[PDB]
Amino acid sequence: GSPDPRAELDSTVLLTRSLLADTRQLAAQLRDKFPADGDHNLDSLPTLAMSAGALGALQLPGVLTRLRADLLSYLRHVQWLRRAGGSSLKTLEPELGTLQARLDRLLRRLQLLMSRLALPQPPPDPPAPPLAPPSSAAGGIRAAHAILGGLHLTLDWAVRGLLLLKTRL
Ligand SMILES: [Cl-]
């Protein structure tokens, strides 16, 4: 019948926590093999909003729209890593492929949530051009740290924001 927004957000948050745990684990595996000297970023990754606090029903559609777009970008980046990241990342498979599959399951769940709740859905933003290959083997590893770290942070803020928003429903 009519969906219970609170229960739908609870379910979505549970699946997001799962993906967050898979991402944290792969990031630790990557750092064990290729230690990193400080935080790493990529220009082609979305900007983290870290939007928590003053989160009410009014913000829910926007939070979900933004998370969908961010996760799609992260998916493209994971796919690129597996494709052109370089031989150095071969042992991160099959874990990176499994992460990609679970990221797809979360995207489907978000689309289902927005449809069931009759929430306005975004206009198709033009797909970004292809990602260039890494400039070097070390550049590919830095990119992997940036992609996994950024995905971790995106999912952490999604959990936090969606649970704070749920408290006002
Ligand atoms: Cl799903």
Numbering used by the authors: 10 to 178
Copy the relevant paper text:
Interleukin (IL-), an IL-6 family cytokine, has pivotal roles in autoimmune diseases, fibrotic complications, and solid cancers. IL-11 activates downstream signalling pathways by binding its two cell surface receptors: the IL-11 specific receptor, IL-11Rα, and the signal-transducing receptor, glycoprotein (gp)13013,26. Following the formation of the receptor complex, the Janus kinase (JAK)/signal transducer and activator of stat (STAT) and extracellular signal regulated kinase (ERK)/mitogen-activated protein kinase (MAPK) pathways are primarily activated. IL-11 and IL-6 utilise a homodimer of gp13026,34,35 while other IL-6 family members exploit a heterodimer of gp130 with a second signal-transducing receptor, such as LIF receptor (LIFR), OSM receptor (OSMR), IL-27R/WSX-1 or IL-12 receptor β−2 subunit (IL-12Rβ2).
We solved crystal structures of IL-11Δ10/Mutein and IL-11Δ10/W147A at resolutions of 1.8 Å and 1.5 Å, respectively, to understand the structural consequences of the mutations. SAXS experiments show that the crystal structures are representative of the solution structure, and SV-AUC indicates that both proteins are monomeric in solution. The structure of IL-11Δ10/W147A is similar to the structure of IL-11Δ10 (RMSD 0.3 Å relative to IL-11Δ1049), indicating that the W147A mutation does not alter the structure. Thus, the 58PAIDY62 mutations alter the position of the AB-loop, shifting the register of key loop-core interactions by three residues, while maintaining the composition of the interacting residues. This register change is due to a shift of the LX(S/T)LP motif that mediates loop-core contacts: In IL-11Δ10 and IL-11Δ10/W147A the motif is 51LDSLP55, while in IL-11Δ10/Mutein the interacting motif is 54LPTLP58. Conversely, stimulation with IL-11Δ10/Mutein alone does not result in STAT3 activation, demonstrating that the mutations eliminate the ability of IL-11Δ10/Mutein to signal, in agreement with previous reports. Surprisingly, stimulation with either IL-11Δ10/W147A or IL-11Δ10/PAIDY resulted in robust STAT3 activation, albeit with a higher EC50 than IL-11Δ10, of 610 ± 120 pM (p = 0.04 vs IL-11Δ10) and 140 ± 12 pM (p = 0.01 vs IL-11Δ10), respectively. However, a small population of hexameric complex at ~7.5 S was observed in the sedimentation coefficient distributions, indicating that the W147A mutation alone permits some hexamer formation and consistent with the ability of IL-11Δ10/W147A to stimulate STAT3 activation in vitro. In contrast, neither IL-11Δ10/W147A or IL-11Δ10/PAIDY inhibited IL-11Δ10 mediated STAT3 activation, contradicting previous reports that the W147A mutation alone is an effective IL-11 signalling inhibitor.
